[PDB]
mmCIF file of C-alpha atoms (C1' of nucleotides) and ligand atoms in Angstrom:
data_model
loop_
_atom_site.group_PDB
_atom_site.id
_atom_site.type_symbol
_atom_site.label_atom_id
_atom_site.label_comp_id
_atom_site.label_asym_id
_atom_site.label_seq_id
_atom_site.Cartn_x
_atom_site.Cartn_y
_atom_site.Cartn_z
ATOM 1 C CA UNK R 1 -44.429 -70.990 60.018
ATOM 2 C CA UNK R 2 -43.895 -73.704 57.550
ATOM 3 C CA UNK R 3 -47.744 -74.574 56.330
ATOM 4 C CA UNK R 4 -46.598 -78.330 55.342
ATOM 5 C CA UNK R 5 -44.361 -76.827 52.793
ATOM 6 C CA UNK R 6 -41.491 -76.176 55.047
ATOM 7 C CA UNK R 7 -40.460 -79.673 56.502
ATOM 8 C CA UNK R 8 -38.538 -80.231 59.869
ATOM 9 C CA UNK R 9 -35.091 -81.293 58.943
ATOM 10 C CA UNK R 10 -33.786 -80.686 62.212
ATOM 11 C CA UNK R 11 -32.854 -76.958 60.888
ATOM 12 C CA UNK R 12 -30.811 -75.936 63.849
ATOM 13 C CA UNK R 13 -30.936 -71.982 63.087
ATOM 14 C CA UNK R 14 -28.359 -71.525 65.833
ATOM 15 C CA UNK R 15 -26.179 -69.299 63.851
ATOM 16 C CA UNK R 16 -29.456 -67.887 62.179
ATOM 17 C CA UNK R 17 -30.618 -65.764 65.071
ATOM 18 C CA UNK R 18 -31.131 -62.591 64.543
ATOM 19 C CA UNK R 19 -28.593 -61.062 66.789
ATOM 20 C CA UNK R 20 -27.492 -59.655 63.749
ATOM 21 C CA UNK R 21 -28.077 -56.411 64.774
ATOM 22 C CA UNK R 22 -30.959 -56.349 62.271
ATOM 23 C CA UNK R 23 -32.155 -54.252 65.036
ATOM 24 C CA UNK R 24 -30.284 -51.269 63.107
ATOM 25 C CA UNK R 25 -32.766 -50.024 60.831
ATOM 26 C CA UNK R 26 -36.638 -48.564 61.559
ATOM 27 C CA UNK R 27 -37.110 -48.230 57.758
ATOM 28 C CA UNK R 28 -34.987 -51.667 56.909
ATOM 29 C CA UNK R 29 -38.025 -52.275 55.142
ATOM 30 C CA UNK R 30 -38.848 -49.537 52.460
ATOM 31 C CA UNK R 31 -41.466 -51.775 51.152
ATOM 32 C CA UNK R 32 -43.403 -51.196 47.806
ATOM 33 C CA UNK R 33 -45.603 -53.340 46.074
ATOM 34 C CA UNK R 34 -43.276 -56.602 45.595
ATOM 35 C CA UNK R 35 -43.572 -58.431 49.217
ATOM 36 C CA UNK R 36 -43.875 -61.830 47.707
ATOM 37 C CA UNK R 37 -42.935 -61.877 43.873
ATOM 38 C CA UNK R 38 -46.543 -62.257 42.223
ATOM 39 C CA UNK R 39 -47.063 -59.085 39.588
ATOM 40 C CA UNK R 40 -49.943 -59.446 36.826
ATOM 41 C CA UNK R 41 -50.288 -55.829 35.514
ATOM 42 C CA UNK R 42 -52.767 -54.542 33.009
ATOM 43 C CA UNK R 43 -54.123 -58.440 33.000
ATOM 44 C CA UNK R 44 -56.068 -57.159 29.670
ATOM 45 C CA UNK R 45 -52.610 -56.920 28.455
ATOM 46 C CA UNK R 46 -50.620 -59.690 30.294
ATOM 47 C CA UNK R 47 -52.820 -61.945 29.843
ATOM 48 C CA UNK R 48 -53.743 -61.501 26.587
ATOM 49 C CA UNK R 49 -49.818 -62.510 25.627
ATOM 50 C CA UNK R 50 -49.552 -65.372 27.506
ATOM 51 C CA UNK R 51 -52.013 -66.683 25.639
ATOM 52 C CA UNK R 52 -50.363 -65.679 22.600
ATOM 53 C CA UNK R 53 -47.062 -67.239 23.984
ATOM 54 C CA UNK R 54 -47.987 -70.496 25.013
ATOM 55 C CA UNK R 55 -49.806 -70.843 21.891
ATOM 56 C CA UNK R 56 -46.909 -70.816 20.130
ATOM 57 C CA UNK R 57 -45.200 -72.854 22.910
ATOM 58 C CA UNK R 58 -47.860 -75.461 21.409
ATOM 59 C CA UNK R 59 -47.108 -74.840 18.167
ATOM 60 C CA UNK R 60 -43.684 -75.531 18.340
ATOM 61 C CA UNK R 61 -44.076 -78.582 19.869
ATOM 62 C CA UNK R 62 -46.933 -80.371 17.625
ATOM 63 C CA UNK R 63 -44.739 -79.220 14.452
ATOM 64 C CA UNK R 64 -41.909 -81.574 16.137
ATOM 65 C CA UNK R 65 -39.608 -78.194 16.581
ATOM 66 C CA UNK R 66 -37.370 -78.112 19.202
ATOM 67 C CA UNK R 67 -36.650 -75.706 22.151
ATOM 68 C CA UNK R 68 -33.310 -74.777 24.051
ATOM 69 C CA UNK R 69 -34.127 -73.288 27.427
ATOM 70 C CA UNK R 70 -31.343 -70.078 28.424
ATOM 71 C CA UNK R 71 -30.300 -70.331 31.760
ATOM 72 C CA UNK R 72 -27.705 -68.310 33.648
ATOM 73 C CA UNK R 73 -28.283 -66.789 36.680
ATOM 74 C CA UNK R 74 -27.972 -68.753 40.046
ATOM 75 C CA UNK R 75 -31.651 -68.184 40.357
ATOM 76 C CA UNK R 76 -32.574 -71.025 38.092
ATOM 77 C CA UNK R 77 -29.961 -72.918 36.394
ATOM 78 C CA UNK R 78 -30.540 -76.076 37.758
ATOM 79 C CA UNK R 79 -34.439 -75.303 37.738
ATOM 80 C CA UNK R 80 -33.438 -74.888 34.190
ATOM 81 C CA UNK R 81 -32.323 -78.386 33.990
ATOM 82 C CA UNK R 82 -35.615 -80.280 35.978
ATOM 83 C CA UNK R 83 -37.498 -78.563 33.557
ATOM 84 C CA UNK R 84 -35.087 -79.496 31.083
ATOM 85 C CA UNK R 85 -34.936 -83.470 31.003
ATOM 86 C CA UNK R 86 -38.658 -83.636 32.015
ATOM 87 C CA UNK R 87 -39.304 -82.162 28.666
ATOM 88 C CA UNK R 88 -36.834 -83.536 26.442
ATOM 89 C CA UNK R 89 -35.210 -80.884 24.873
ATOM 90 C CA UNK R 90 -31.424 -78.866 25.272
ATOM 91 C CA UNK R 91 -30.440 -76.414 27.938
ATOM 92 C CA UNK R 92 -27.676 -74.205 29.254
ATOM 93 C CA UNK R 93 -27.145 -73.220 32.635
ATOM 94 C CA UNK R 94 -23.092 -72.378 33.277
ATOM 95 C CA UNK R 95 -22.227 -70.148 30.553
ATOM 96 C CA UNK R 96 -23.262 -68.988 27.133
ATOM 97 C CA UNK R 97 -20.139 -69.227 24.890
ATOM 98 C CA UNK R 98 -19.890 -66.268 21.914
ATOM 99 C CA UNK R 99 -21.215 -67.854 18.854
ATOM 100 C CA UNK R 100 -23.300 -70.911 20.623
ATOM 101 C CA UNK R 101 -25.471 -70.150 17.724
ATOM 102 C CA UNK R 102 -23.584 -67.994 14.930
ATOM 103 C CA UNK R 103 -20.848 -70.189 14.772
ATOM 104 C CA UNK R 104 -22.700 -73.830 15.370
ATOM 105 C CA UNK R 105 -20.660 -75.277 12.628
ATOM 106 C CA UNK R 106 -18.234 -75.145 15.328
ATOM 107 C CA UNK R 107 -19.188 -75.034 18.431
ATOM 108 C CA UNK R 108 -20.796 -78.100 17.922
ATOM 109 C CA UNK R 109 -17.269 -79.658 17.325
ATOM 110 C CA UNK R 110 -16.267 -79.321 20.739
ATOM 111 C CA UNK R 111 -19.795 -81.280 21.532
ATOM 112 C CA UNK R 112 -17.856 -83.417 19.126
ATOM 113 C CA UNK R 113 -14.731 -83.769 21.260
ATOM 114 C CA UNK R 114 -16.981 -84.210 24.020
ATOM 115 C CA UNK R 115 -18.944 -87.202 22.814
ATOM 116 C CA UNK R 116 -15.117 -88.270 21.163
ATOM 117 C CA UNK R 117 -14.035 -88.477 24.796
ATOM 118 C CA UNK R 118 -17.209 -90.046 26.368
ATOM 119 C CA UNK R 119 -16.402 -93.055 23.764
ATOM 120 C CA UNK R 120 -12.888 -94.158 25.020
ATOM 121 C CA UNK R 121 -13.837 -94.287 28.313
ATOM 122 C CA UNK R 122 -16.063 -97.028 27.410
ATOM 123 C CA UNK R 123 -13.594 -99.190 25.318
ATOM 124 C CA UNK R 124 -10.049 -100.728 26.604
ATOM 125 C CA UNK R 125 -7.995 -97.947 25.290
ATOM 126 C CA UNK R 126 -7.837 -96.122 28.971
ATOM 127 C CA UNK R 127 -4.597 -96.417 30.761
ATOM 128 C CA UNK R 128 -2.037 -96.501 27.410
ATOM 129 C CA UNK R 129 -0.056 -93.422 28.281
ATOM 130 C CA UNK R 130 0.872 -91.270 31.034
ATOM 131 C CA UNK R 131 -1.678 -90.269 33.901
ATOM 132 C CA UNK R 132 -1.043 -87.048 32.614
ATOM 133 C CA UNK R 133 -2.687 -87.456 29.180
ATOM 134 C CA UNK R 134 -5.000 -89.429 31.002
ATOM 135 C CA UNK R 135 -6.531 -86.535 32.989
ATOM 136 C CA UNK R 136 -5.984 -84.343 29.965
ATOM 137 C CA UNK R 137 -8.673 -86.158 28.411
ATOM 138 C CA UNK R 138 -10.391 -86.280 32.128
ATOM 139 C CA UNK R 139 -10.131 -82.376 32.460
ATOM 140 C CA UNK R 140 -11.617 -81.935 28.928
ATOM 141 C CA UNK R 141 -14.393 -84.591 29.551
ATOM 142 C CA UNK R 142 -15.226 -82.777 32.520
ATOM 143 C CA UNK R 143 -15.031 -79.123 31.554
ATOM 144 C CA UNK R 144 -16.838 -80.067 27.923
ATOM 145 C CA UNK R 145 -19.721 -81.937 29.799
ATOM 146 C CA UNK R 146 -19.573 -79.025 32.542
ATOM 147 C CA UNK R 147 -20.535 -76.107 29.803
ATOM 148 C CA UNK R 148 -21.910 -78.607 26.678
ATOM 149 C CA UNK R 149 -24.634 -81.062 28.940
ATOM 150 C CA UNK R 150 -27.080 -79.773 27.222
ATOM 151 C CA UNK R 151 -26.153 -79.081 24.119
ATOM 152 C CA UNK R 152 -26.008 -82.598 22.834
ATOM 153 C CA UNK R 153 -29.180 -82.473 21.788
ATOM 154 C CA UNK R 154 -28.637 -79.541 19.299
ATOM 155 C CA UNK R 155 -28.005 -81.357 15.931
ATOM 156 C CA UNK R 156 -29.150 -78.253 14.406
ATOM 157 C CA UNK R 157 -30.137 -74.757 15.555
ATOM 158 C CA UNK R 158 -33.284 -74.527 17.317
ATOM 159 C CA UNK R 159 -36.728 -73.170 16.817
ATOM 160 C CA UNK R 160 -37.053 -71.131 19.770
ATOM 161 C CA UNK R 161 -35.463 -69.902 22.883
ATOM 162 C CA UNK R 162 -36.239 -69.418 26.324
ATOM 163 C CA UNK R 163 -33.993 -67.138 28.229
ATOM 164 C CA UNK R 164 -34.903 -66.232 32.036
ATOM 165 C CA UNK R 165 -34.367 -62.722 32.009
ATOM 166 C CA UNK R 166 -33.433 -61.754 28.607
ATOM 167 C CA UNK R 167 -31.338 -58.910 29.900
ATOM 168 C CA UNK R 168 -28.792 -60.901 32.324
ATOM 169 C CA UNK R 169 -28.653 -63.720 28.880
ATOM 170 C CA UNK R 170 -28.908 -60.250 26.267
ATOM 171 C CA UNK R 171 -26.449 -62.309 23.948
ATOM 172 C CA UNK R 172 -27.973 -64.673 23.592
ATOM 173 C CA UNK R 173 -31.385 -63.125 22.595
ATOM 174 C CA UNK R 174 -28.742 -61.031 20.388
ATOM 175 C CA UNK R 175 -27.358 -63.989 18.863
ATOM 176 C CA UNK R 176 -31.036 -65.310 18.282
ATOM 177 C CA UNK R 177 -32.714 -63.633 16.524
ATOM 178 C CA UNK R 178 -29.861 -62.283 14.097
ATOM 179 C CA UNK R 179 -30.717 -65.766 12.975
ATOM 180 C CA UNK R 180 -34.722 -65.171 13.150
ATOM 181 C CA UNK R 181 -35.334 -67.719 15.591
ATOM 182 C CA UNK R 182 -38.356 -66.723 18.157
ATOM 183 C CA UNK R 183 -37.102 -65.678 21.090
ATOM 184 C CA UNK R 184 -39.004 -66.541 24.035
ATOM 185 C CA UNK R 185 -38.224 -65.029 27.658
ATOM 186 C CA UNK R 186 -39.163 -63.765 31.272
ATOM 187 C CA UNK R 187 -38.634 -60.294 31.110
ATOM 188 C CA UNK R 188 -40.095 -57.759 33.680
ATOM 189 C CA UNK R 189 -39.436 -54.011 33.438
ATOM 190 C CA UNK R 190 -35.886 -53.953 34.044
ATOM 191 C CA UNK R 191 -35.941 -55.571 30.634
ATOM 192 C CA UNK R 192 -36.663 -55.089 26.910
ATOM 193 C CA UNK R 193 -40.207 -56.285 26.013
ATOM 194 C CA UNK R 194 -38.898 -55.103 22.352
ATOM 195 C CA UNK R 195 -36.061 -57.972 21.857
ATOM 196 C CA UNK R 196 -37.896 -60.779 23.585
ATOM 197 C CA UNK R 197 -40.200 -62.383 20.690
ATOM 198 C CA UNK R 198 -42.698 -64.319 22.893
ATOM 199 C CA UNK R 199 -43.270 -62.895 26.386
ATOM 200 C CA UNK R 200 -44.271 -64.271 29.701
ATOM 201 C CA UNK R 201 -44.102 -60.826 31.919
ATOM 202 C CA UNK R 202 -43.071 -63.201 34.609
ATOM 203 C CA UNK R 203 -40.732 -62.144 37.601
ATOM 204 C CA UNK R 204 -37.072 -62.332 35.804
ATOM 205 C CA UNK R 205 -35.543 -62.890 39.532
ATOM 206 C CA UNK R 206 -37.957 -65.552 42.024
ATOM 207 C CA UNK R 207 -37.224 -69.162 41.936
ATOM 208 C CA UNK R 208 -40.887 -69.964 42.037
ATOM 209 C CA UNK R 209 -42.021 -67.341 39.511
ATOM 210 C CA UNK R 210 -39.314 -69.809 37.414
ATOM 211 C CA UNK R 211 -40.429 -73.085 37.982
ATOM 212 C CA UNK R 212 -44.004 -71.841 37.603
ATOM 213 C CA UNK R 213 -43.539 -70.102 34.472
ATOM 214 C CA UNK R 214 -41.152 -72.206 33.026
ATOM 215 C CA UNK R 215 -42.836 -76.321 34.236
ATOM 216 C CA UNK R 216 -46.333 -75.621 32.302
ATOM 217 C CA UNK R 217 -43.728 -74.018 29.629
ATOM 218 C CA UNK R 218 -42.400 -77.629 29.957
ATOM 219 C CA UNK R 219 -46.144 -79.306 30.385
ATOM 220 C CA UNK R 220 -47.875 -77.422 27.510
ATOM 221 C CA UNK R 221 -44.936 -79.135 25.729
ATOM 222 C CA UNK R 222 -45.470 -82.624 27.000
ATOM 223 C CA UNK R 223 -49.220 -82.284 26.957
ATOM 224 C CA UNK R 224 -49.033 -81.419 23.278
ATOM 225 C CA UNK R 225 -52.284 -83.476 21.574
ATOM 226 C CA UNK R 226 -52.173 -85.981 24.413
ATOM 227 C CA UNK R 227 -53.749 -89.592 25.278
ATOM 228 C CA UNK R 228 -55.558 -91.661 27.818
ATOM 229 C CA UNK R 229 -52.841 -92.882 30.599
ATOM 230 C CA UNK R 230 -55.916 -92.413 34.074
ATOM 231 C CA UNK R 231 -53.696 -93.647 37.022
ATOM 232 C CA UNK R 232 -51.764 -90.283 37.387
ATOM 233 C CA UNK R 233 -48.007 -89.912 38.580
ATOM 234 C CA UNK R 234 -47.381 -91.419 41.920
ATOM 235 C CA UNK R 235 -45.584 -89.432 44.892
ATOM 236 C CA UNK R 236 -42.417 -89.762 46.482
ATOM 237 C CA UNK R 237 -40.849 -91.944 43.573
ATOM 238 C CA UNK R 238 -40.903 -89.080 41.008
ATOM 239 C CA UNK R 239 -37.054 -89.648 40.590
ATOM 240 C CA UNK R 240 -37.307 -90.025 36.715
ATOM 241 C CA UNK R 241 -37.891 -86.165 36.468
ATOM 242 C CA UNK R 242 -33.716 -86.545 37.549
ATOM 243 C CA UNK R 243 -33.907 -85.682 41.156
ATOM 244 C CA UNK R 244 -30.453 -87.301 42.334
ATOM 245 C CA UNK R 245 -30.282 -89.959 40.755
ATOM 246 C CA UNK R 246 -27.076 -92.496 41.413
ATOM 247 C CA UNK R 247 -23.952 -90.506 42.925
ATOM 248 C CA UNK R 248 -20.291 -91.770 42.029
ATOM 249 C CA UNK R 249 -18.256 -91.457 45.183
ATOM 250 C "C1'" A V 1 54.547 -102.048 -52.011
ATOM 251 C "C1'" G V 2 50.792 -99.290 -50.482
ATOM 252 C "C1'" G V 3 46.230 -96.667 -49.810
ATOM 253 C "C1'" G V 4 41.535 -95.580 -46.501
ATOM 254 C "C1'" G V 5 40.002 -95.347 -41.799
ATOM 255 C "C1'" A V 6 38.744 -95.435 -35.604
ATOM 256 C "C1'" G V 7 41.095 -94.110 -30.057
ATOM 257 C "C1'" C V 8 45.433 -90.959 -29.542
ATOM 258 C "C1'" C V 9 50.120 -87.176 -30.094
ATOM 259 C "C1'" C V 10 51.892 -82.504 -32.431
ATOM 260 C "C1'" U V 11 52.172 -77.662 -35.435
ATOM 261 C "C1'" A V 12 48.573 -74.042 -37.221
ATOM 262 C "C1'" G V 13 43.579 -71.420 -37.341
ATOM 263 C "C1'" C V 14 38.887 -71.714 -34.670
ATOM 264 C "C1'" A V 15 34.314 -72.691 -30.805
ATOM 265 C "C1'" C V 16 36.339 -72.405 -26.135
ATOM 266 C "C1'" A V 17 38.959 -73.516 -21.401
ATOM 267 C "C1'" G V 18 40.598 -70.725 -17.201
ATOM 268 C "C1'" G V 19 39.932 -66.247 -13.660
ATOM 269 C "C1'" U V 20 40.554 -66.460 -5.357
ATOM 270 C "C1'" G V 21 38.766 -60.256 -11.190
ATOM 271 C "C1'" C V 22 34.260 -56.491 -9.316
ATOM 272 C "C1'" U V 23 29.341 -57.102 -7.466
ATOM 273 C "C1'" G V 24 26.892 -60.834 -1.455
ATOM 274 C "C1'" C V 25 22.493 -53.332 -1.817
ATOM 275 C "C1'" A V 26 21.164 -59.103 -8.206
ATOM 276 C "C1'" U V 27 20.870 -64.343 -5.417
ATOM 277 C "C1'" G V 28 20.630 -69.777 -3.725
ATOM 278 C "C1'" G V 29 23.121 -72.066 0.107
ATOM 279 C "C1'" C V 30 24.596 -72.302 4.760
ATOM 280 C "C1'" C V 31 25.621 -69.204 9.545
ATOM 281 C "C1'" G V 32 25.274 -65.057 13.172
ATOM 282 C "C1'" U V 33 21.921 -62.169 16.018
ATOM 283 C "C1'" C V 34 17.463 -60.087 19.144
ATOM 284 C "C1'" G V 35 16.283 -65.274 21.730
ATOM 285 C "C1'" U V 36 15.962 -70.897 24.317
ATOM 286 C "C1'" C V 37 13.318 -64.713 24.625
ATOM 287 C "C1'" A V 38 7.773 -66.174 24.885
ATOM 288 C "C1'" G V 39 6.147 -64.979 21.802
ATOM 289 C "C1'" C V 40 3.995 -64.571 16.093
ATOM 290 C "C1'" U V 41 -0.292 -65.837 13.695
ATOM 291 C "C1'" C V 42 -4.711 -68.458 11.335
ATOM 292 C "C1'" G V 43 -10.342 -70.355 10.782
ATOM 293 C "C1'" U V 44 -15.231 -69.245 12.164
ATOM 294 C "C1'" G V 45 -18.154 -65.789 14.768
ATOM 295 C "C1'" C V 46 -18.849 -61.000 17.124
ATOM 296 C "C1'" C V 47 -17.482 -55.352 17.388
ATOM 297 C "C1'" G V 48 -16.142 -51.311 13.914
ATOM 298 C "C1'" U V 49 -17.910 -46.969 7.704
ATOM 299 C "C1'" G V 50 -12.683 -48.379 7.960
ATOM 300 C "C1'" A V 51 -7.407 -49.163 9.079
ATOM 301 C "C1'" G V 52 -8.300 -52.953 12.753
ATOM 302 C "C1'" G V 53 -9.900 -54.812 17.569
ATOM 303 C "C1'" U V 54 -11.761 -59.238 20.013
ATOM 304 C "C1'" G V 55 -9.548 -64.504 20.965
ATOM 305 C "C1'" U V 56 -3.403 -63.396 22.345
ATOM 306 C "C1'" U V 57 -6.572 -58.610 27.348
ATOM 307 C "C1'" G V 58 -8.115 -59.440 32.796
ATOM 308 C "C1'" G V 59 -7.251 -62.200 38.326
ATOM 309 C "C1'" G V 60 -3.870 -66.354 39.642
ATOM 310 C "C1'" U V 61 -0.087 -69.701 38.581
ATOM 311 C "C1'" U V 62 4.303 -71.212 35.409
ATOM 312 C "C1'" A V 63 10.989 -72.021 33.347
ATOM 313 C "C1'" A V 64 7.041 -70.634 29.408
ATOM 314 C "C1'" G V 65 0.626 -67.535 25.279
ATOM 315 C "C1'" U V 66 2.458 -73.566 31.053
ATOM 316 C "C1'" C V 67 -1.901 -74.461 33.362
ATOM 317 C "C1'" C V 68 -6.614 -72.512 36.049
ATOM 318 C "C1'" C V 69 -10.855 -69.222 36.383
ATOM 319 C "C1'" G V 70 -12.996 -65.128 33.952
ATOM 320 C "C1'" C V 71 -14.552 -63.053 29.275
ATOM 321 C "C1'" A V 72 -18.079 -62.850 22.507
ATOM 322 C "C1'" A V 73 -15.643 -65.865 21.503
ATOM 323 C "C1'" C V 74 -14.874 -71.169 20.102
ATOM 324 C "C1'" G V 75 -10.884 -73.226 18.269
ATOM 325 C "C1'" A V 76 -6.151 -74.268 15.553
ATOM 326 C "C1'" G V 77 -1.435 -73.686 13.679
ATOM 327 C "C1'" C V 78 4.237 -72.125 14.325
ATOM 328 C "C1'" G V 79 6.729 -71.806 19.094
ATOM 329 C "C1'" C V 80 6.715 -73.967 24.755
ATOM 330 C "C1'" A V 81 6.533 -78.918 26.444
ATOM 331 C "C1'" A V 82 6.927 -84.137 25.334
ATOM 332 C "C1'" C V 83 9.237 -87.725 21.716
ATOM 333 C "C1'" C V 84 15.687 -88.325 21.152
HETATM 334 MG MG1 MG J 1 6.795 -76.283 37.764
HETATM 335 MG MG1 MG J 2 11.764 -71.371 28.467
#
RNA sequence: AGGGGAGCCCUAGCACAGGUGCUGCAUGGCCGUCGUCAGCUCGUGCCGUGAGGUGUUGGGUUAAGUCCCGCAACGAGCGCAACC
């Protein structure tokens, strides 16, 4: 049952019966107290550091700091990036690369190369040598935008971080705060609520957990001081956020 | 008449020429050779008390450290290739 959420999008489910011989095991489900993915122990505990988090998350934002978002795992990345360009601000979602903050001072050079590239595809220099160069600077272009969209925005190193699941991203909450910058994270009890800075006992795994966690992370952000603006978002258009916006091919 | 004097010839004395005369285990230079083999390194960062390791390992591909994907590394140089 689909309570409006769901959708009928002619989901066939065909090859989704479950002939599976899921008919195997009495005790298939071993059950425990995680049946949905919705945990708030100790509330007088929880509770009382979210709170403390996203009053930093405030704080950050009203001093004009800045903050990259950690994503890795399959489980978010692109909720990583929604989140991302709705709240203006850097992200990572393939791959962390050793150093993306000890060693800046050059990482950021391959940004460089990167926005080097994006330039002569603009002017008249393409086409001057052969299609093998050509894609060499394609290939590059590509693979530079594939693991740096998202750090373009890093002119300097950040004032926070927020790595989902700051166990499965460990280097980069290493890399962090050997350079005392806040680390902000998920974290759950297969985690270390010593390394993470600012908490959010959230479920590290979950999609939704995620994009509940992390969109107010995003709003708070957005929201900070504020303004008048009465006739609310509209539905259905809310491509701006990124959706899918224009395809090439 | 003749005398002085510059380039030069010759005897004599001298500084010295000359030497394929030793030493390439004193050397430059150039060459051979492993090897036309696919490799040898550097910067920054990270690991390590340290010598160092990581990258240059791994899966795949290549005439090739050639290229792909992975990865605490990200790069870059000499080489490979291309230029002739
Ligand atoms: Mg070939
Ligand atoms: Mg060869």
């Amino acid at each position: 049952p689909v309570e409006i959420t769901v959708k009928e999008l002619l989901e066939a489910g065909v090859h989704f019966g479950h002939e599976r011989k899921r008919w195997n095991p009495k005790f298939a489900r071993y059950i425990y107290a995680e049946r949905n993915g919705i945990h708030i122990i100790d509330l007088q505990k929880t509770m009382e550091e979210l709170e403390r988090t996203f009053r930093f998350i405030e704080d950050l934002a009203m001093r004009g700091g800045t903050i990259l978002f950690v994503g890795t795992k399959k489980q978010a990345q692109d909720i990583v990036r929604m989140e991302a360009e709705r709240a203006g601000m850097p992200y990572v979602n393939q791959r962390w690369l050793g150093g993306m903050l000890t060693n800046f001072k050059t990482i950021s050079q391959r940004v460089h190369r990167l926005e080097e590239l994006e330039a002569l595809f603009a002017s008249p220099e393409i086409e001057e040598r052969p299609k093998k160069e050509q894609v060499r600077l394609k290939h590059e272009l590509e693979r530079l935008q594939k693991y740096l969209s998202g750090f373009r925005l890093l002119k300097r190193l950040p004032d926070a971080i927020f790595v989902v699941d700051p166990t499965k991203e460990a280097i980069a909450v290493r890399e962090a705060r050997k350079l005392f910058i806040p680390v902000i994270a998920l974290a759950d009890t297969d985690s270390d609520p010593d390394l993470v800075d600012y908490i959010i006992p959230g479920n590290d795994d979950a999609i939704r957990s995620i994009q509940l966690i992390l969109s107010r992370a995003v709003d708070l952000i957005i929201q900070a001081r504020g303004g008048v603006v009465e006739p609310s978002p509209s539905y259905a258009l809310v491509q701006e956020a990124e959706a899918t916006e224009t395809p090439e091919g």
